[PDB]
Every structure is written in structure tokens, then in C-alpha cells.
Amino acid sequence: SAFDLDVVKLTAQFVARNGRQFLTQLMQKEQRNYQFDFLRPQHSLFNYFTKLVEQYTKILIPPKGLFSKLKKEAENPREVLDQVCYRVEWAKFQERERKKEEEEKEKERVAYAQIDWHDFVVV
Amino acid sequence: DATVYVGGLDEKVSEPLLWELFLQAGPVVNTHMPKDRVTGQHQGYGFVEFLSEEDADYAIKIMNMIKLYGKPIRVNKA
Amino acid sequence: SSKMLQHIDYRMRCILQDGRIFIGTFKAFDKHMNLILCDCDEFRKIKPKNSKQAEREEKRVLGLVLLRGENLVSMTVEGPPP
Amino acid sequence: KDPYFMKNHLGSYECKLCLTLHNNEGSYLAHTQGKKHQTNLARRVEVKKFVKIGRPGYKVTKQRDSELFQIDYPEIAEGIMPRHRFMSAYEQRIEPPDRRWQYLLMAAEPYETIAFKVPSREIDKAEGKFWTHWNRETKQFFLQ
Amino acid sequence: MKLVRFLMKLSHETVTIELKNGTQVHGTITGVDVSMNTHLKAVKMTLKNREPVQLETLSIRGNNIRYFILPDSLPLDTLL
Amino acid sequence: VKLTAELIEQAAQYTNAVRDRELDLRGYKIPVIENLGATLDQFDAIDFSDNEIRKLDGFPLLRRLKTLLVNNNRICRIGEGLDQALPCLTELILTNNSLVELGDLDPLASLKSLTYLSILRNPVTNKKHYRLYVIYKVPQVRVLDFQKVKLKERQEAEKMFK
Amino acid sequence: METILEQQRRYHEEKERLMDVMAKEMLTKKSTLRDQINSDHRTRAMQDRYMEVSGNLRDLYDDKDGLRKEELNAISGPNEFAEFYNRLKQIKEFHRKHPNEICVPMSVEFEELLKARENPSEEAQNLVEFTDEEGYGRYLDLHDCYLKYINLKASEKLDYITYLSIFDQLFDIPKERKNAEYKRYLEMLLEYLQDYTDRVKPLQDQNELFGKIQAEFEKKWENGTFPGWEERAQRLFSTKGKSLESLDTSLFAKNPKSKGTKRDTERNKDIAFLEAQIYEYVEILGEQRHLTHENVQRKQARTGEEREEEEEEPYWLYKLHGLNINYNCEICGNYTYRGPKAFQRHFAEWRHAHGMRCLGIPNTAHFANVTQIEDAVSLWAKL
Amino acid sequence: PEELQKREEEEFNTGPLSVLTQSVKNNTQVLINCRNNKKLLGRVKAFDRHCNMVLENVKEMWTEVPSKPVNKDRYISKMFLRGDSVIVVLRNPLI
RNA sequence: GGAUUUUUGGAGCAUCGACCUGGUAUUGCAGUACCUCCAGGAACGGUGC
């Protein structure tokens, strides 16, 4: 599975340097008798592979290391600790929201299993 | 192909009772009920081997709405 | 306890009272701090007695050696049983 | 209190731990001390009653779509969403004859259930989380 | 009372045994017998005017040991 | 099959015929010698018979070693850092090698404590003035190819290549 | 190699994995002080590795500015991609899937149930950096410093309480002279205090704190950090008073003050820096010193038993029944049986029936003792 | 038994080690001479019949020649000294 | 585990191994200290006092 991953990485590297949505380096290669099944959205890996192209967008950021140098994430451990604490607080808030959604689903299942299903009214 | 797995049975069910329950849809050639010899209780699952695969498939497809001791019994192909 | 029998039949190095070190397979011991070192070799350091001379250690193998407890100072484990 | 020594039907003593027999009473107490006995010992409703029922007037509107019913409900001031479910016409208050169709009914806690009969077998899905929605800002239920 | 019983009831203690011929072995003493045989593991031995080597295990006898040194976090009333 | 710590730990280490600790490692065909520091300086002779070592290099610092047996191998080149790893090396058995040029013995003269040498059955010995060049390169070697050095051979080595 | 496309994305993914591992370590609750100290040391090592990875990725920008004109050009495109696909058109006979492209940094930055330690931090141990008397930052070892002070003072009239009272001062009068032999012990005590402060908090920035301490020693402590109302301005090195600020500024550049004394700013600058570091360590870690003094007082006021309690915290059955005898059954795929009665019980079972149903022979009583397939086929054809 | 313990107590209170009995009575410092010319000044917390002493907060002083030898000394919190290296034991030291 | 054999302490000279050149007889089957004799040079090392 290394050759398919390398081909997907090469397609994500060649498709990130495009100036339009349809005028890329992979749309013209489909008509050049080159079999590329990773371009269709029906595949299971392409939804990750285009996400790898989003990782190519992570290589296309101006503070990513192309024209500037990061100083808070590279020369400040306190900023990284504050970012880790904010990520832990966001994960705790997401877990609390998931617990509230599970409690709401349990309350809806308790209310749906206790209602009267014999009072039928056709208007 | 001729053996069907019956699960979801209580511990109070016996092997002649399971044979009499399975004989209502077809004559079963053999019935194996795995049980622990240390405690002497059933595991709630058994395997009924009939004389043919079509009769076993019909007995597995016709026992989808069987209830024993308040518990629904499930039949699958094995 | 049985701490002396735990390192049996291993290549142990016992330090002598004169400064030499005898390394050998400590197979048998006793209550009088004796040791039966099979295929043992004794190494003794020599004094340079000069300003530019280095410190050397002459080593000679003797085989099975019966070391008493009056000369043994401390024994250290050096090699596992082959 | 020995849980292994029992009395048989012949006036003797039986040890089920080591499966031994003893005729007199002096042999049962002397059988516990030994190697075999030591080896055998070592080897071994509230939400339904509190729901108000006033039966108000519902406002349901159907529309034949192609690729949907819309119910206008008042403000319930609660997080309980109205649930839709498909049932049969065999269970009723009067049990009228010639009832062999299905009916999808939507029920809420402050309001009554609105039911619509479907003559077709399967043309849509009556699932609550698949093709249903309930806008609380406008308080409107949609079922597709 | 003999002092061998106070030294035999010592386990996982970082002590330092100074020998007679200018040798000092500092390490965690793991075993002590009635004949003052000190068996230690992962100790450091320093001889007379020599470099301190490190040994994974050592066994000093009773007649070769000259003095002992215990840390300050060790009561002497409960060991005697 | 490469040489590792498991090949040295499972080897048979005993007493040799010269009253020294030797570990037998014959019949291994190791292409490279590495990770030999597991002996913890408890051996005096290391045998490397029937090996496919192309170059004698990658030896750790061992002060207790006094004999090297690299016979029956395919060593064509020799390493330069051999004196800093074995300061007490006295015996060197480099017989049946692939040495062709006379410059291969120039890192071999760095060992000052070397007294025994064996360069027999080698193509470097077939050339002219090979023993004189070996005597002029390493004067501390007293026995070369099971033969003692000579005074006339030392005079011819000091006279030639002036 | 794609140093700006693939390597930068790999470094960003490694930094995101390190940040996720640090957030998972910080979000989990702690129950012991040693496990919390080990988790803090692992988080500090992960932060140092992430800083090293960011410093290695930040230097890969020299060739990116020259290659950005050719990578973003519209004249290029599928030609280099087709050349790279033709170069990667080798034999694919190595049928082996490698799912460790992204799961291996996720598993390397995690811990196990038996040992709560990371894969780069598997060889780390809390016993190699802290002693048993310190308690992994709970207390401070001051027995060796008290022994060194008693050896330097050459008097047995100084106990541990007197040494703790003398070490608690920050700007008071010293117990000995500044030009005496106590500075060599004070520098070692300041180094031990700095090592204990660095080991007690591994997640704090030690280099920034050292730079701030050096800036406070240079810009403030060298310019009259202790004002007065000889009592107006005092010097830490020269140990002399001053009338006003202008006289102190004129005497700061004097010839006995520069190199014409035994305690000037040229030779006694390291001792003054060590004294400032010891004062900063006493002001920053005063609570740990107070807890160590309270523990020493509790150990001294207790008895021997309380101090000892505080410092400690069958073949015959197989031979008679016919077992352990190898028997081969050629009907059920030449299976092995360890008993004649066991083979007779397994002959009328489901496994032998399923083995015989593949050949077409029904399960009857005539094929009970049948073992070979040819004899069973002959018995089936004869009936 | 009890009689042997009473005889050992009488031999420790009225024998040659009775000055050692002064080390555990009033907690006075004693001067012990070693075989390596190292004088140990300090009180004895525990003793035995084989002259094995347990010293607490002792000071070991010796002479080491680098000329003239210097009196390099050290201070130990707790130490144990065997009776084989004990040469001379002084009850009341000078300083 | 407190006093003669083990664990509660006796704490420039002599000798031996070698290094390098010359003449001389033994060509031999064995578990071993050692191993033919003489002359010249040494600016090699170990132990005791």
C-alpha cells in the first residue's frame, strides 16, 4: 500500500500548485491515457487523499515556513502549554456537549416510549 | 450447511425440550448443546443438524418469531 | 540468606588483599569465604616507578584455583555462565 | 461444618470432595486428615402520567413531492421533540372492520397526535433521525 | 546484644562500606548475613588513588570491611 | 546474516590453547564486524574464521584483547583506526586475504605493541621486496609469517626506499 | 526530495501529534507525585523534541524561494508528474501493507497500561535524577550541605536547625566572612539549589529564567539594588558603604574596585553571581525549604519506631485410563487422538460426521470403526 | 538467657568497656583510633562485645601528606566501626 | 561470627623472565613446569630489601 500512498501524495503535491478549480495538474492527466481511480469521489481513500491535499494547504500557508518563521511555537514553551490547555478545554467541552446530546437522546427515547399510540386522529 | 445455530435461549431450557421445539418444523438428526461441566448449566446456544441443508434452512428461516420463556430465540446458518 | 549461592557458576572477579584480581567461574563456595574458580586468571598491577611510564597489569591464567577467605576482599560479577 | 460429608441411603458417610465412603462414624472424622483430602481441598410510567392531554387543533399540510408533510405547532417551551411513528390499523378504540392499512402518527407532549394513513406499502421512511426535522425558531415540523 | 543483628536488618539502603586497603564501595546494600557479608547491587568502588569504577553487583566480606557509613535518614533506636 | 549481539552472546567462550579467553565464531559468514562491545573487555582472542568481511573495520575499544584471528576471509582493505581500539594487540593473523597493493600495511604499522604478524597466503607477499617493506613499515613486529626478523633484512629495509 | 512540500507537512504533522500528546497528558488526572513528575518530564522532552523539529523545519526555506517560481508556474505541470510516475513504475511484487505511515508517531507518543511512559522516554527513570530523601521534589536534601558547613566551620556547635535558620536569610548579615572559605561551599550549595529548582519544574523555561536572573543581576544588582535612607548605598562585592549615588558611581570604576582587591568585580564576580542565584532559589523555592524543615523537625521530634515507619514508606491417572497414547485418524484429516475411549467418543460426534459428509458417506453405525477413507468408501459402495 | 544477659550487662558496666558505658549514659563524645591513623571523635549510640560501635555525628580526622601534611578531616552523620580496626579508645578527649 | 590455619587485623644490592648475532649434535610419538652447550652487545621489564 506504499505505492498507492506515494501516488496519492504526488497527486496532492501536483494539485496544490493550481490557479483554478478545474485547471489543475490532475485534470489534464486524466485525458492523457493515465489510469487514476483516486480522482473520483466514490472511492474510500480519496476522501482522505483530498484531505492530504488539505495538508498540502498546510504547506501553502504564509506562516507555515515559506516566507516567515514561527517564534511562539518554536521558542516559547509557555505558548505551547497554553495551546495544549486550550485544546484540552475544547476536548472537555466537546465531551460535555456529547454527553448532553446523549442525555437528550435518552430523554427523547424515554418520552417516545411513554406516549400514547392509540389516540389516532385523521383530519 | 445442514447445521443451524439457535441462540437466545434461557438456562432452564433442556435438550429434549429443544428437540421437541425443533421437531415442529422438521425432523432433526442431532442436537448439540454446549454446557459447562463444572456448574452444570447451559450457555444459551445450540446447534441443530438436520438430514438436509434445505430443511435446515427452512427451519432457520421459519423460527424467526419464536419466544421461549419470554426471550426471543434467534436462528442462523452455520 | 542465600545471596552467595545466587551468583554460582558465573565468571566473578574477586579482589585479593595484595591488590590483584582473580577472575574465574565461581562454581563452589563455603562458609569460610572460599571460592573454587575454574579456568581462573589472576591480574596484578605493576608499579611504573617513573614519570613517563604507564601503569600496566600482568595477567596469568592458572585454571582451577582454590581461594581462601583470608586473602579475598570483595567479589564482583563480571560474566554470565556460557 | 463440613459441606462435603453427607449421609447416603444405607446409613453410611460419603465425601463428595474426594468421593470416599465410610461405614462407621469414626472413619468419617478421620478421613479429613490426610493427603488426598488436602489435595482435594487445595484443588477446589412517571412521564406518561404527568403528560397533559388537552387535544388541541393541529395544522398539518401534505404535498406530493418527487426526488413531505409540514405540521405547524405552537411553542412547547421544552426540549422534547415530537416523535413520528408508523403503526398498523389493527389496534383501535372501536376496532372497525376492513382495517388493513398503515398510518404514520406524530405525537408531542403538549399537543395531540396527528395521524395520516398511507395506502402504499413503502414510499418513504418513517424514521425520526433520517428524513425528519423540527425547527424550534419557527416551531414547525417537517417529515419527508 | 551483638551489632550483627542491627546490620542484618538493612535492605534497600544506600550505604558506603570502607574496606581496609584503601577501598570504599558506596551502593544500595541488598543482603547482610551474620558473618557481616555485605552483598550490594549497582555500586561504585574506589580504591586507594584509583578511578572510581562502577559494578553491577558486589559482595564484600566481614573481615575485609573496616568501617561503614549510613545516611542521616536512618533511626538507630528501632534497629537495636 | 549480519553480526549482532546475539551472535556474540550465544557463542562458545572458553579457554584456548595459549591459556587465554577465546570465543569461537567460526562458520558465520558475517559481511561486517559491528557491535562487538558486548564482551565488556573479558576476552583476549577473537576468532573470525570463515567470514565474508570485506574490510576489517568497525572495532570497539577493547583493552583486554591481545590476539586477532582474521584468517580465511575476504579482507581486501584494512581500517585506519585499529591502534586506538586495541592498544594491547600483539598477535595479528591476517592470512588468506585479498591484499594486492603494498599500501594496505601502512595503517597496520600504527600498533606499537604488535609483535606477531601473519600475512601468508596473500597476493601482497608475491611481489618483490614485500618482507623488506613490512619490516620497514612496522619495526616493532618481531615475528612475521611464522618467521623472526633478521638484522640483514632490517639493514636492507633501512637502506632501501630512502 | 520534496523538502518544502512533503518534509514540511511531515514536520507539521509531527508537531500536531506532539501537541495532541501534550494535551492528552495535561487533560489526564494525576494520583501520585512521582507519576506527575514523570509525566511533566515526558511533556518537557516532547516540547524539546517539537522545538528541535520546528528549528529543523524553519531552516528549510533557502531553496524554497528559488523553487517557488518553478512550482507555481503554469508552463510546468503534468510533464514532471508523468516523469515521476514513470520513475515510480518499478516492480510491485513486494506484497506487504505498511499501515505505520501515520499510526507509528501516534503510537510512539503514547503510553501502555503496565508502564506510563512514552517510546522515546522508555529509558527515563525518576531515580536517576532525584534522591530518596528528596521525594521527587517534595523535600530537599540538606544533610551533606550541613556536614560541609560543619567541616568548614570546624565546630560541633551547629545542628540542623541552626543551619536551617542560617540558610533562611536572604539579605541579612552572614554567619561568616565574605572573603573566607565559605564561598566554595556556598557556590556548591547554589549549584545544588539550581539543580533542584530545574528538576522540580521541568516544564518551565530554564533558559529564559536564567536570562532573567542574569538581567536582574546585571541591570539591578550591580547598580544599588538595596537602597537606604554608608547606609544609603552598599556594595555586594566591595562590602563597603557609600555617601550618595555619584560617589558610588565614581567608586564603581575605581582601581581597587576593578582589580586591586581580593573581592573585586574581576575575581569575586562568580561568587556574587552564585550568591544571587542562591538568593533567587531561596526566594522562589521557600515553600519547599519550609516543608523540608518541617519534615526534619517531625523526624527529629519522633521516636525510633515512628522514624522507622516513616522511612519505610498426573501420570498414574493417564496410564491407568489408557491416555497419553498417540493414535492417527485418517478420516478427519489424519487427526491425533490421545486415547482409545476418547477416539471412540469422538467417532460418534459432530467433527467426524462433518469429516465424513465431505466424502459422501452418511453417518450410520456401520462406519463407526472406520478409519481409512478407502475402507469407508468400500463399505459405502458395498452397502 | 536472662543470666547470660545479666552477666553481659555486668561485664559491660564494670569491665574494660565501662568507659563505653559512659558513651551511652551521659552521651559523651569518645575518641577512637583506627588502623589507618584516622581518629574518630564522637559519641557511641550502640556497642557490643566485639567492640563494634555505632557513632552518630562523628568527625574523622587524619593526616595526608601532599612538604608538610595537612589535617584533612570530615564529618559523618551516622557511621559504624568494627572492633578489628579499633586500637585505642579514649573516654574523655582533650578537645 | 571479639586473639596461632580462614570472620573481629601485623597493621644501590639479590633473583627471574626476556631482546638481537655467530659455531655445534639429536628428525624424535606425547600430555608435561622448565628443558643441548659456549662467546658478544643491551640505552627491556616483574618481586624482595
Short mmCIF file of C-alpha atoms in Angstrom, two decimals, chain H:
data_model
loop_
_atom_site.label_atom_id
_atom_site.label_comp_id
_atom_site.label_asym_id
_atom_site.label_seq_id
_atom_site.Cartn_x
_atom_site.Cartn_y
_atom_site.Cartn_z
CA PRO H 1 19.03 -16.25 78.54
CA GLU H 2 18.41 -13.82 81.41
CA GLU H 3 21.51 -14.86 83.38
CA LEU H 4 23.78 -14.53 80.34
CA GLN H 5 22.28 -11.11 79.59
CA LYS H 6 22.84 -10.05 83.21
CA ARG H 7 26.44 -11.28 83.03
CA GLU H 8 26.97 -9.36 79.78
CA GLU H 9 25.47 -6.23 81.35
CA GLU H 10 27.75 -6.62 84.39
CA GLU H 11 30.78 -7.12 82.14
CA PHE H 12 29.82 -4.03 80.11
CA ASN H 13 29.18 -1.90 83.21
CA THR H 14 32.18 -2.99 85.32
CA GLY H 15 34.67 -4.28 82.73
CA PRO H 16 37.07 -2.76 80.20
CA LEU H 17 34.18 -1.39 78.11
CA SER H 18 32.72 0.54 81.08
CA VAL H 19 34.05 3.76 79.54
CA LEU H 20 31.96 2.73 76.53
CA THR H 21 29.13 2.52 79.08
CA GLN H 22 29.87 6.21 79.67
CA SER H 23 29.20 6.77 75.96
CA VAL H 24 25.55 5.66 76.30
CA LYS H 25 24.88 7.04 79.80
CA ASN H 26 25.61 10.78 79.55
CA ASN H 27 26.03 10.81 75.71
CA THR H 28 29.65 11.97 75.84
CA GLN H 29 31.97 12.01 72.84
CA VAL H 30 34.72 9.38 72.66
CA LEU H 31 37.95 9.25 70.65
CA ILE H 32 38.58 6.02 68.73
CA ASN H 33 41.86 5.26 66.96
CA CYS H 34 41.79 3.33 63.69
CA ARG H 35 44.41 1.28 61.86
CA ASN H 36 44.77 3.89 59.09
CA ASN H 37 45.72 6.67 61.59
CA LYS H 38 42.20 8.14 61.44
CA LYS H 39 40.91 9.43 64.78
CA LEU H 40 37.12 9.39 65.13
CA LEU H 41 35.67 11.80 67.70
CA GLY H 42 32.02 11.27 68.63
CA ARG H 43 29.57 9.58 70.97
CA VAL H 44 28.62 5.91 70.64
CA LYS H 45 24.94 5.03 70.29
CA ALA H 46 25.31 1.23 70.35
CA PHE H 47 28.09 -1.19 71.29
CA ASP H 48 28.64 -4.93 71.60
CA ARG H 49 31.12 -7.47 72.99
CA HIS H 50 33.20 -7.44 69.78
CA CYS H 51 33.90 -3.66 70.14
CA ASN H 52 31.57 -2.81 67.25
CA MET H 53 30.49 0.80 67.81
CA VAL H 54 27.74 2.87 66.19
CA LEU H 55 28.67 6.56 66.12
CA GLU H 56 26.28 9.44 65.48
CA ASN H 57 27.55 12.82 64.18
CA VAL H 58 31.20 11.81 64.34
CA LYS H 59 34.27 13.59 62.99
CA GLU H 60 37.09 11.61 61.36
CA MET H 61 40.46 13.39 61.22
CA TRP H 62 43.64 12.10 59.59
CA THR H 63 46.98 13.31 58.24
CA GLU H 64 47.54 13.20 54.47
CA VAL H 65 50.91 14.23 53.05
CA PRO H 66 50.64 16.12 49.71
CA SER H 67 56.37 19.37 52.35
CA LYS H 68 54.10 19.25 55.40
CA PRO H 69 50.97 17.11 55.83
CA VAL H 70 47.61 18.79 56.32
CA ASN H 71 44.92 17.79 58.81
CA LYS H 72 42.13 16.93 56.39
CA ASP H 73 39.01 15.98 58.35
CA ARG H 74 35.43 15.02 57.55
CA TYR H 75 32.11 14.83 59.40
CA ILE H 76 29.71 11.88 59.15
CA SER H 77 26.11 11.87 60.37
CA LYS H 78 25.97 8.14 61.19
CA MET H 79 28.70 5.52 60.97
CA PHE H 80 29.60 2.03 62.15
CA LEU H 81 33.11 0.98 63.21
CA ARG H 82 34.16 -2.65 63.62
CA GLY H 83 36.24 -3.89 66.53
CA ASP H 84 39.07 -5.24 64.39
CA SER H 85 40.38 -1.78 63.43
CA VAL H 86 39.85 -0.32 66.92
CA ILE H 87 43.27 0.25 68.52
CA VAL H 88 42.81 2.80 71.33
CA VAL H 89 39.53 4.17 72.71
CA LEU H 90 39.62 7.36 74.79
CA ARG H 91 36.66 8.22 77.01
CA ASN H 92 37.30 11.92 77.67
CA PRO H 93 39.09 13.71 74.80
CA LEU H 94 41.07 16.91 75.17
CA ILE H 95 39.27 18.99 72.53
#
